[PDB]
Design a protein around this ligand. Structure first.
Ligand SMILES: [Ca+2]
Lengths: 163, 159
């Protein structure tokens, strides 16, 4: 985390405006919040395993109600930190620092020119869609075949167990 | 169906972005994902087996864990190393570029990607994104986990 000289900072500020950097921060916050919500079951499991008052029969019996009440409540409250102004500010500073680290001032200015051009503005809107179309299309054609190949061999391994 | 002038403009674009390196990274990513799915697929197959009773299934887990998992893992995701996958991934790149971009936009992109700043961009832009996400993750992941953990501790104690 280094000091950005004045002319480089002003160039990055113009680049961040041209790529709509706040929209990108918003997507990072929403993705982290989602990741936090997906960790709730594992964190609740850890709190149950490490709780120091309940015996092992009471813990095993508490699972049904914790699954029904605690998980929805924890999911609802998870990742609040990602909606704060502090997070947004920090993600903005992180964008400045990342651009200053990998690009020179003159490269940042070239980038801004491309992003403000008509084809650059198009690129900002569709280029992610281009990546998703490629990956999702190949996934649809090939993920089933790879799963089935492993599953069919897995059937043979289980059928081979001799008890 | 892509007209010839757009097809030839896309061919030049893909050379300028080193499209085969992007295909190779997609294939490797898919292969790794196939291998990481092996324990879940083997549990499906053990669960669905109709010859072993449930005590025999539990007793089989140690040797399945030890022999079947390394075997299935070395064999998972072979389809992603075939020439047919590469061919389909190239074709998917043509289709995607043709669908969202016009011929003159394709030519503008090539000019940008062939410029010195375009080539730097091909080289570091993914690293820019990872640095942003990883720095924030280092700072905020622990705070988010602690927030959920402390509320989970109160939920467990209130049982
Ligand atoms: Ca024209």
């Amino acid at each position: 985390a280094a000091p950005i000289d004045a002319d480089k900072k002003a160039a990055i500020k113009d680049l961040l405006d041209a790529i709509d950097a706040p929209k990108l921060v918003s997507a990072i916050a929403n993705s982290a919040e989602m990741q936090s919500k997906q960790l709730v079951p594992a964190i609740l499991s850890d709190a149950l395993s490490e709780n120091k008052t309940l015996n092992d029969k009471q813990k095993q019996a508490a699972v049904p109600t914790l699954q029904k009440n605690a998980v929805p409540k924890l999911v609802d409250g998870a990742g609040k930190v990602f909606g704060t102004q502090q997070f947004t500010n920090d993600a903005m500073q992180a964008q400045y620092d990342a651009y200053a680290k990998y690009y020179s001032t003159s490269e940042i200015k070239d980038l801004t020119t491309f992003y403000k051009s008509p084809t650059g503005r198009k690129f900002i809107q569709v280029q992610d869609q281009v990546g998703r179309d490629v990956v999702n299309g190949l996934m649809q054609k090939y993920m089933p075949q790879a799963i089935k190949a492993t599953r069919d061999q897995a059937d043979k391994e289980v059928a081979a167990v001799k008890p």
